[PDB]
Design a binder for these strands. Structure first.
Length: 163
RNA sequence: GUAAUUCCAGCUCUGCGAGUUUGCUCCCAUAUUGUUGCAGUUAAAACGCCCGUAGUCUGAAUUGGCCAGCAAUGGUCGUACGU
């Protein structure tokens, strides 16, 4: 894109903390109400972004007319597929399950999660059902659809988000 | 054990039939040897108790979701970019 990359470098002027931060990539989504932007960060840089963060995110969200959900590059295969490098034994962090669950605790950062579950249907198909802490939002109440779109892009999963 | 529906005989009747009883061994009947598949409060059957090695046994977790299904499969979401 370089909508967010141009937007970040101008607001990064004058700040010691945001001085060395970088963005790899971004994926826009269809959110019914507005759109949402999902901004990937090089892993070691997550807690550098995420230490303060809430200074600049209102300024970035207001300018682009969209919500911003910051995410780590969490990547993870047991069987070689080619075009990828795979550890034989592998590691828990490396595996997909850790990746998909680490992704949530980025996406909805500031509230954190009380409950999580699945609902398996009579047909067979499955619906994840995350529950946000009932204390942080307040704010979380406003952006629920945005996450359901955004999380369905990254992991492929039909979720909902509730109190 | 002097009235024998079981003895000893006759008569009638029954079975199987060029076959038919009688011994011993052996399988089934028998979940009465139990992998399938027994039983152990009182019928036979839970060590007097604890440690404990050989032995048998050993919680969850690791590449999927979504659509066309009648399956084989084939697309999309994820790009994780080694030889």
């Amino acid at each position: 894109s370089e909508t967010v990359t141009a937007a970040f470098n101008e607001i990064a002027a004058g700040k010691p903390e945001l001085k060395d931060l970088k963005i790899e990539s971004v994926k826009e989504v269809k959110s019914e109400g507005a759109t949402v932007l999902v901004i990937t960060v090089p892993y070691k840089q997550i807690k550098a972004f995420q230490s303060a963060q809430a200074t600049f995110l209102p300024d970035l969200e207001k300018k682009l007319n969209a919500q911003i959900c910051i995410i780590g590059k969490h990547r993870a295969p047991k069987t070689p597929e080619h075009g990828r490098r795979f550890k034989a034994i592998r590691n828990y962090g490396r595996t997909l399950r850790s990746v998909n669950d680490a992704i949530l605790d980025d996406l909805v950062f500031p509230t954190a999660i009380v409950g999580k579950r699945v609902h398996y249907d009579v047909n067979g198909k499955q619906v994840t059902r995350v529950i946000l802490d009932k204390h942080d939002a307040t704010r979380v109440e406003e952006r629920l659809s945005g996450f359901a779109a955004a999380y369905n892009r990254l992991t492929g999963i039909v979720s909902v988000f509730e109190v």
